[PDB]
């Protein structure tokens, strides 16, 4: 009886700037955008969410002493395979997969989660190659 969209979803493109916000508070909003929680036509099994582009990923910041205390782990399937780096080294070299690990942590787990991860595009600032899609600038709610 209620509406449930399928193959009629219109997906927009959004640009999110990460110059002054946390890792962090923006990542939950980006995950909610990618899920489609901002649209009234949300249906939980058809991925009504839309594309988002994040620029200035190197300008991200995070409060406290997390630059030296937050540790990322990438354990292999080999014994003694625990490899670790700090948040400063992960931000300094390539913070793109920092942001994608944040979004992947806040996205749901499943086939739709891997599908909604594909709409995310994180780039080192401040230009993106998606000008042909004509993305609009999105301002964060807070």
């Amino acid at each position: 009886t209620p509406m449930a969209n399928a193959s009629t979803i219109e997906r927009k493109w959004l640009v999110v700037d990460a110059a002054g916000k946390t890792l962090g508070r923006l990542s939950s909003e980006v995950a909610a955008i990618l899920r489609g929680k901002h649209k009234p036509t949300y249906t939980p099994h058809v991925d009504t969410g839309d594309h988002v582009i994040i620029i200035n990923a190197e300008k991200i910041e995070l409060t406290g002493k997390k630059l030296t205390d937050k540790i990322y782990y990438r354990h292999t399937q080999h014994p003694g395979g625990l490899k670790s780096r700090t948040a400063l080294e992960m931000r300094t070299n390539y913070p793109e997969k920092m942001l994608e690990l944040a979004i992947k942590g806040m996205l749901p787990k499943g086939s739709l989660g891997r599908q909604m991860f594909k709409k995310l595009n994180v780039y080192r600032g401040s230009e993106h190659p998606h000008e042909a899609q004509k993305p609009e600038v999105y301002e964060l709610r807070g």
């Binding site: 292999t76 399937q77 014994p79």
Partner: protein, 207 residues
Amino acid sequence: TKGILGRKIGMTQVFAENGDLIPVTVIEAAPNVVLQKKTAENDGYEAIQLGFDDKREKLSNKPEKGHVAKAETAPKRFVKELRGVEMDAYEVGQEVKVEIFSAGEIVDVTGVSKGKGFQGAIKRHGQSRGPMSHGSRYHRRPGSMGPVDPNRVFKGKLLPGRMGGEQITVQNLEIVKVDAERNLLLIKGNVPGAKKSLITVKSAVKS
């Protein structure tokens, strides 16, 4: 850096300037023709392509014939890249010869090692052998797969399999003699691979 690639013939012994006897590996490695120059603005990195041991037109494809048309040369059996050479210092179609190496230099030698087939753990991994007597039924076997508690075998457990056919690099070999007339390089020591196989000789990482 500099380098050249070719075919090794076999091993011999050469005494030089004293009574001392040197094991010598003979490599035919000339001429090599520059086929393609990789640039950072187009390919993303700097490298050159070297072609060796040209063949008949029956054994070469039309893409292979068209790829070597720019260098003005016959199609060649072996193509490999060298990275990173001193850019540019070589133009497309220039012949690289054995005169670039003097007979006192230190070079890196790499190649595909000899195949041994599917071999047991004793030969493939150097594992020690079980007793042949005192009632023992155990020899030539790889060992216990591990503990009980993980309920699985850990990755990296050394087991029988195919030995050889992989790329092996031997570091810091010395050129004994260079032969510009007969296109030969004489290298001190042992070189991986079988006879008439492809051997790449590059300058060592100094120092």
